[PDB]
Design an enzyme around this catalytic site. Structure first.
Site, mmCIF file in Angstrom:
data_model
loop_
_atom_site.group_PDB
_atom_site.id
_atom_site.type_symbol
_atom_site.label_atom_id
_atom_site.label_comp_id
_atom_site.label_asym_id
_atom_site.label_seq_id
_atom_site.Cartn_x
_atom_site.Cartn_y
_atom_site.Cartn_z
ATOM 1 N N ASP A 192 42.681 58.358 26.983
ATOM 2 C CA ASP A 192 44.142 59.081 27.480
ATOM 3 C C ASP A 192 44.485 59.724 26.166
ATOM 4 O O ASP A 192 45.770 59.541 25.878
ATOM 5 C CB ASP A 192 45.140 58.198 28.239
ATOM 6 C CG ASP A 192 46.437 59.056 28.981
ATOM 7 O OD1 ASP A 192 46.004 59.986 29.272
ATOM 8 O OD2 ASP A 192 46.996 58.370 29.263
ATOM 9 N N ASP A 213 49.378 53.489 23.792
ATOM 10 C CA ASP A 213 48.591 53.739 25.350
ATOM 11 C C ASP A 213 47.294 53.691 25.525
ATOM 12 O O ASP A 213 46.591 54.651 25.501
ATOM 13 C CB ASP A 213 49.500 54.907 25.826
ATOM 14 C CG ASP A 213 49.101 54.871 27.407
ATOM 15 O OD1 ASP A 213 48.571 53.840 27.951
ATOM 16 O OD2 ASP A 213 49.667 55.785 27.925
HETATM 17 N N1 LIG Z 1 57.520 55.801 19.042
HETATM 18 C C1 LIG Z 1 56.930 54.849 20.011
HETATM 19 N N2 LIG Z 1 57.124 55.175 21.284
HETATM 20 C C2 LIG Z 1 56.479 54.326 22.087
HETATM 21 C C3 LIG Z 1 55.667 53.100 21.652
HETATM 22 N N3 LIG Z 1 55.226 52.547 22.772
HETATM 23 C C4 LIG Z 1 55.641 53.412 23.896
HETATM 24 N N4 LIG Z 1 56.171 54.301 23.540
HETATM 25 C C5 LIG Z 1 56.658 55.450 24.282
HETATM 26 O O1 LIG Z 1 56.694 55.001 25.810
HETATM 27 C C6 LIG Z 1 56.030 55.715 26.397
HETATM 28 C C7 LIG Z 1 54.881 54.821 27.339
HETATM 29 O O2 LIG Z 1 54.206 54.136 26.832
HETATM 30 P P1 LIG Z 1 52.766 54.417 27.359
HETATM 31 O O3 LIG Z 1 51.895 53.077 26.932
HETATM 32 O O4 LIG Z 1 52.345 55.814 27.069
HETATM 33 O O5 LIG Z 1 52.890 54.139 28.937
HETATM 34 P P2 LIG Z 1 51.744 54.541 29.901
HETATM 35 O O6 LIG Z 1 51.600 56.098 30.018
HETATM 36 O O7 LIG Z 1 52.630 54.096 31.169
HETATM 37 O O8 LIG Z 1 50.334 53.471 29.928
HETATM 38 C C8 LIG Z 1 54.980 56.683 25.583
HETATM 39 O O9 LIG Z 1 54.510 57.883 26.095
HETATM 40 C C9 LIG Z 1 55.728 56.736 24.466
HETATM 41 O O10 LIG Z 1 56.844 57.809 24.633
HETATM 42 C C10 LIG Z 1 55.849 53.008 20.199
HETATM 43 O O11 LIG Z 1 55.123 52.054 19.735
HETATM 44 N N5 LIG Z 1 56.347 53.709 19.532
HETATM 45 MG MG LIG Z 2 48.777 54.582 29.798
HETATM 46 MG MG LIG Z 3 51.358 56.864 28.229
#
Ligand SMILES: Nc1nc2c(ncn2[C@@H]2O[C@H](COP(=O)(O)OP(=O)(O)O)[C@@H](O)[C@H]2O)c(=O)[nH]1
Ligand SMILES: [Mg+2]
Ligand SMILES: [Mg+2]
Ligand SMILES: [Cl-]
EC number: 2.3.1.-
Length: 298
Positions: free
Chosen positions: A193, A212
């Protein structure tokens, strides 16, 4: 909408004995997840009941594998807290800090800054794709087979209510999928992704973090270039992906492009399928409309 923040505070303190929440805010979300910044230090990523009932299990197994076997300065989530169940899953890790890469920011970078970033990316991917994945050999993803299954799901649900144009778009995709050879190449562990909204820059515009890995697995090497090659407002552009492929080396660029093009062609169908699997009519409606828009582009 504060009921969910308060609820999340309670759940964190309930499921993780001795964790105290001094502060908590929503800092982002995905299609089915919300990410909470806790004590200005931890990300707590959460999902309620979904189709991937072992999804955060896999994601966590992946972070564990990578933190064990990768050798890089680039940060990734390191899981300190987890609760996993059918109805609710939570992953907690220290926030990766920095600034998310965007086309705007890229365009303010010097040529050298841009090259270094491209190098940082190529180098990360090279390292990940080169890992012997025998230890997580079960985390395979067969995109062709998955599409076949999703197609069967369509046939079993709404296919017969579709218009001829919608049907033809789908069958035409299926025909192309049957003809392509882009699945018959190197398989390896991919982020899967890999878009610029998961890429974090430090204060020197160097790649400092990647988030992610929720969709990661053993899959076509081409997968991690799909968004790098994308020509859209959200991504940087095709030349950016091309250059990165060259730096990465030993990979058929035309085939990487064909892979991207096929994924793009599937998107409206994917959208419909998501709509069906999660009982969300809006997604079925958007996907169908999108088929018409693409049919009329020429
Ligand atoms: N700055 C920062 N943002 C984070 C972090 N983890 C998550 N995010 C924010 O949270 C959102 C969702 O996390 P993600 O793992 O992408 O979720 P998924 O897309 O549901 O699998 C991301 O797009 C980021 O905007 C981190 O460790 N640092
Ligand atoms: Mg994801
Ligand atoms: Mg994500
Ligand atoms: Cl509809």
């Amino acid at each position: 909408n504060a009921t969910n923040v308060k609820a999340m505070k309670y759940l964190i303190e309930h499921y993780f004995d001795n964790f105290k929440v001094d502060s908590i805010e929503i800092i982002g979300s995905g299609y089915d997840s919300v990410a909470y910044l806790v004590n200005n230090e931890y990300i707590f990523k959460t999902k309620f009941s979904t189709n991937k009932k072992k999804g955060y299990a896999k994601e966590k197994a992946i972070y564990n594998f990578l933190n064990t076997n990768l050798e890089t300065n680039v940060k990734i989530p390191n899981i300190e807290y987890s609760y996993i169940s059918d109805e609710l899953s939570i992953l907690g890790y220290k926030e990766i800090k920095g600034t998310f890469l965007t086309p705007e920011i890229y365009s303010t970078m010097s040529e050298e800054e841009q090259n270094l970033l491209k190098r940082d990316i190529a180098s990360f991917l090279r390292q990940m794709h080169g890992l012997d994945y025998t230890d997580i050999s079960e985390c395979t993803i067969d995109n062709k087979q998955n599409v076949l299954e999703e197609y069967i799901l369509l046939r079993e649900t709404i296919y017969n209510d579709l218009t001829d144009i919608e049907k033809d778009y789908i069958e035409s995709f299926m025909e192309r999928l049957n003809a392509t050879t882009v699945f018959e190449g190197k398989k390896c562990l991919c982020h899967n992704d890999f878009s610029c909204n998961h890429l974090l820059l430090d204060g020197n515009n160097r790649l400092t973090g990647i988030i992610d890995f929720g969709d990661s697995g053993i899959i076509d090497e081409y997968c991690d270039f799909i968004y790098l090659l994308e020509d859209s407002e959200e991504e940087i552009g095709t030349n950016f992906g091309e250059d990165i492929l060259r730096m990465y080396g030993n990979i058929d660029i035309e085939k990487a492009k064909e892979y991207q093009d096929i994924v793009e062609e599937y998107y409206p169908i994917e959208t419909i399928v998501y709509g069906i699997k999660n009982i969300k009519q809006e997604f079925i409606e958007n996907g169908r409309k999108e088929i018409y828009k693409r049919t009329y582009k020429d």
